[model samples]
Target: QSVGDSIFPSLGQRGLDVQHYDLHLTVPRPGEPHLSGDVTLTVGAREPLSRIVLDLLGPRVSAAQWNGQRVRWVQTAQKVEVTLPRPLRPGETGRLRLIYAGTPELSGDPGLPIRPGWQNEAGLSYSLSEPHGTRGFLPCNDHPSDPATFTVRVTVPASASAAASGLFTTQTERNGLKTLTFTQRVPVPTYALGLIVGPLERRTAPDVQLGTQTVHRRDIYAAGLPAGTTVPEGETARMLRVLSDWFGPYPDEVYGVALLPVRQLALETAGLTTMPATSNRERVRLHALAHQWFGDQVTLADWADTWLSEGFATYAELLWAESQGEDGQAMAADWYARLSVLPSRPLRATREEEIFDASAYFRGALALHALRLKVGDAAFGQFLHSYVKTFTGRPVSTTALLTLVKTQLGAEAEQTLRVWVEGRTLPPLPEPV
Candidate 1:
């Protein structure tokens, strides 16, 4: 589950289907395994296939065939490719199965960097949700610009169970082999497809329904917590309440954390949020919940628009932190003081760096704070309500934000936003302390 999205242009008759995959991963030694599989790919009849790319890593595979005949392939270190001689004839639509296998070299050796493998709890065979991590397990489009839905059936040893990104439909264990069938309903970007499989302990909470279709369930995967770290009692309920009240409703059929007991970064994978064992603080807890709406529901236009996720979450916590009364003022003043130190310029994510610049977070928050000052609490809150309601499930971008400010506050608001967007530094604000 790790790419921007897939562009299946001829989505109607043109579709790629993996009907059956007999992936034989032989672990001759304790940790050394060789992977071989019989892959059956079904395509539309007589359609010209642009490119058939298979994602692979650490594997040295040879001997490839399609429908029992040898096929020529070009190799790119980790990726292997084979173009069909001609389009499949119409009415001759059937499975184009291939048999081949290879041994993938594991990373973390002297010459290699540590790649997040599939076994981690971060979703998918790895955490390909960021950058290009999907090449480890599948051969396909490996970028966000491509989006598609898939039906994946992974066969693993009978000693193990495989879990995929979407709905769990079936599991058939036979002859020391297990076939796990998964159907993903949503049209997700490659990075969002999650596959985590282990002897996972599943814990469920009371279902909190949102409308007729959506419901919130805390699917806390029972993983070992690090030393001195325990899941809080009633933390899930409190979190659900805090987020639901603030952000209208939980937008998905499922919402929960797949707790991994390792020290690393957390991920917001669509309905599921992968959290670290160490992130036990209240701010981290609250912010992770907030991302389901800000980051998960409405993704950024590009990696450059990362502020839409990070900035909103930062300000969200600011609002939550400020609710502590006098202590809130102290925290707000501290942040504003920091903002006052920023270089004077309109804030933006340049091509060279991330959009989640500290200046944008504080400076942008300060601009909102300034609007609060100019318009007063009632109207400012109304503006926030209006903005949130208007773009609840819509795509948001820097331009969208500008349009929103103008629509709500008129030309003066547009002018204020322009000053913030173009100026090279944070503007001065009224002292709060």
Candidate 2:
């Protein structure tokens, strides 16, 4: 088997590139666990293509149309394959519309990708599709490498409010139903799609200034908060400031946070982040915020290189704490000490069992810390600034990182990175700067 081979081989197809997703979702009333939506995808073929397959699970397809004509399609447990009227040649663009509706699969286990689809508890409902759950709600190419712009129109009961992945454009309410439309101008992966619906209370905090630009911070929470629950708005702003200082300006025009009732892992879902209602600790919040720069902006071309996402965010958490007067060196040293005894694993994971493991998060950050010490603070900081600016809204790989490091720091730095990332054993921590 080759790298990135998986249990679900048909999920990630490479022939077509998705350009945009026009998704219209009709969320059910509170206590209802069903979802209905129509998704229109604008895609371009990489080469001659006779059919288009998209990763869509659970939701049944009622109808499918290709370029406005009805087409024969097949829906399996993993994907939906549409037979095109004619083969699309290289560089040819086409559109496919799927009208689908069903109750999405729910996953309470934190180890799996958070797919608490259409979850309702205490009269509240929300959707959190991360890693691999977007396919449960919408039909599309659900891979990080295939980033696409999104225009989402969600219709929910007028009594409840809805917040999704992009900037809120407008809302229209009739009789007892409201339709809210959001547009994500930037290209985003499928896993980054987030949706929240309930009696949500919206709060807007002061804008964060990054140089001359302004970054808006918004929070949407359940109207009723459990005891000891502190909304993470202020903490999010501070983290964003520290991140923008090191990584240059924020990539998205707006940043948002939503509180879900489910107690699962929080995900850095593009412009919006979904956090569990129970856990809003500083470190958890910081890790998700850092992802806007690392994972959400400069995504991985292949999921095997998840260190580019998790590792960068994990290190950013330490950097944020250090900016707030904590001892960053000692904190990193402590983590290194703990991870030292663990079995050696490559930062770039190729095996299915290796992805998203502790090595990807802890060791990956340690590797970056080593690189920073080797290159000095000045060069390392400049390198990060350049990296965010250069790869904004683009998919990257370990190879891409090596090339950039070589250019910014020199060949020696590149080789140093290789040992830490591609090598098996954990290298000793660099001497105190």
Candidate 3:
């Protein structure tokens, strides 16, 4: 029931638009793997829909209902098919609920380099739902093409703390169990729905000023990890000012990071990024933060156009370097020198195993530099800011970007970008003005 995505042909379902996801989860105590989950979905019909299909890789569903009535459904390897009580015509809306319990499996996908699911790493329980892991804990549309608001509630032992993707609303403790709640008013795709529950500590810093909006900043890490262990001193607000200057004001109201023991992984999980406690590189941190505007707010409509996320964020790294007095042109020249010798592949839509390859990051970024030089600094700055603002709160495709470039700078600028993105051989770096 895929939604015709070129790279991930078996992920999302069609004829349905997910409006919101209200998930309630109860996490087990230390050393406990099994957990309980109940999710209510608000969905609208894109076309006439007789049945609702959702993506759920594991975790057996104990009960299911549609609009509060018992609904029949069958679970397959990668999805759950539910027969709606009444057919929904186009533009109609409905509610769905699923009660389930099980230990989430660490299912790995070929499109992702990581095992995107629930994991207990070094005595901490967290979920990295990037690309496909959201299905491990609850039922969802499970594709970036669909963006929805999330109201996630997690219950854990009174001794533990939980953090998620939205603004932290409240927490109440009763009967030795505490329920932590988050409210995400802005729409987010399923892959970026972040959740982490464990023995952690929260540190709220001063608010960052991004014009009229006051950006709230926080970092939730393991109890033993120090304050600057995740993001070094003055880096969060510094990166915020730099990125917001180039792109636009931060897209979300809240910004934070949850430090986990997965040292090799750092995910741009919407409002809060999942960072490895051992990782402290400014470039890596800025890349994840850059995704707040590039990858999280304006997401990818298809897995094929992954460069729009990776390449956009990677270019932000160079922006950060330049702000710190580094010679950005020399750095980009070196990047081009190295990228020219590497294997050539489609930076536009890569294969499953190549989704995270270097072309998506380095080569795509070099092409951005090419576009920047060809368009000049002032024009490129306007282009970057306009691109993010135009698609701030929805999933977008490369065609949208091409249209923007053509409209903003002309067909020549768009064609220049097309050669860099769609050509097999890497184009030469644009000559300095």
Candidate 4:
């Protein structure tokens, strides 16, 4: 019931439009917090809208009004429904200016750590990704597959500063309270939604160069930690230069690292990436850095094609490893050998299955290596350049990718890709040249 209709378009066909929200919250317990917000929504209907249902994550509503008029409706924890006073025709749109206030009953993975100020004796933290964090704060469509542009305004205690992923619009402080407003233009899945607020110090560093077109700024956020923990600024800069030379250009505006207090977890949220502070931070940092192209810019069309994300990230890291004189060929071979251990599968299978296992990441990456060798450096370089250009900010899948390779390289490459992506069977390698 929590993640119903994740990929399928439920509200999209109804033509739902969420214009704006004015939200306010007061934290009481880690399990529950008081939340209030005014929502402006536009609905397209054929017959008069007799009823409306909103996905609210179990918020006990104290007050709710529709269109500046008093209305009564039946309510529960999972959903809220309001019946219109009068019926309207289909194809017509309705506007509702609503005000709802309540304390959200918190629910999340209990295994996650609690940061200071986010939790008291009650066990409260802002929110983390699992289901819909938006529902915990506001009534919304919380799924990663459906994307929306959100103007988020959040207010934490006077001691905390709000941090979210996206372009910062403006922040103001009045009466000893800090307010943060961010506008995310990209269509983001609900699971990818992120927010953090606590006693935070925002530190700025010089932009790191990934290529001529890509730039990154490492944002340092610290609460209670050792002061000596600093970024390997010089080594990272040299790696950026090397990545540019190999990949042609990492063409994105800002690429930055946000060091947070977490275990070995890394999240690639567009231009801004978050990674845990650890010794392997460099490897993880480079691994996520490569996503600036494949996962960040050129994303997968659906969840089943998750290999595109994992495969590209894995391969990009291998490319980085090879450049640093770490047995690149052996690494590539190891990737292929692991795939051989699996049951027969194509190097280019396009079906929606659990290809996200090690086979897809490492083996799928080796498939790319095979294509690179077949096409040669010059053609492969141009193919990479053209592929990025063709699919940025658009939905792409394994089948779609076959078309791309076909267009850039030729029919054989396309045939080869199909065999690899669809065969569901790995074959013996061509004798090593």
Alpha carbon lDDT at 70, candidate 4? 64
Q: Mind giving the per-residue lDDT tens digits that candidate 2 earns over 1-433? A: 1113242244556767888999999986765768898989999866677888887767899999999889999997767888898887787788899999987766343554444344566666666665666777788787777788889998999888888878888999998999999888778777777677878776777888777888877777776666756655477777778889889888787886787665778888777788777666788788888888887778777777888988899999878878999988887888788787789877777665566788888888887888898888788889999988777766888889989998888999898898888878888875565
> Compared to the true structure, candidate 2 yields what TM-score?
0.92
State every prediction's TM-score relative to the real structure: 0.66, 0.92, 0.95, 0.71
Top-scoring candidate (TM-score): 3
Alpha-carbon RMSD, candidate 2: 2.6
lDDT accuracy of residue 114 in candidate 3:
86
lDDT of 1 by residue, 1-433 (tens): 1222222121112223222233333222212234454445443333445335455565544556555676666656655666666544545443444444554433332211224333343222224244345444444444333334545676766655554545556777778777776555543444455555444444666776544445545554534566655446666556655456556666455656666665655555545565656665666666766666666555544445555666666666666665433354455576678866655545555532334456656666666665555666666667665665665534466688778878887777677666666666566663442
lDDT of 3 by residue, 1-433 (tens): 5787787787778867888898999987743557898999998877888888888866898889999999999888878888998887777788899998887777677657788877676557777777777787778888888888999998999888788889898999999999999988778788787788888888898899988879998888776564557566788888999899999788888887887755657888888888886655688789899988877888888888888989999999989999999989887887788787887876776577666777888887887888888888889999999998888655778888888899999998898888887778788876687
Better of 2 and 3 by lDDT: 3
Separately for all candidates shown, the number of backbone clashes (residues 3 or more apart, or on different chains) is: 32, 0, 0, 30
- For candidate 1, which ten residues in a row score worst on lDDT? 3-12
Give the whole-model CA lDDT for all candidates, comma-separated: 0.52, 0.79, 0.82, 0.56
**Residue 253 alpha-carbon offset, candidate 3, angstroms:** 0.8
Runs in model 2 deviating more than 4 A are 1-8, 106-120, 232-234
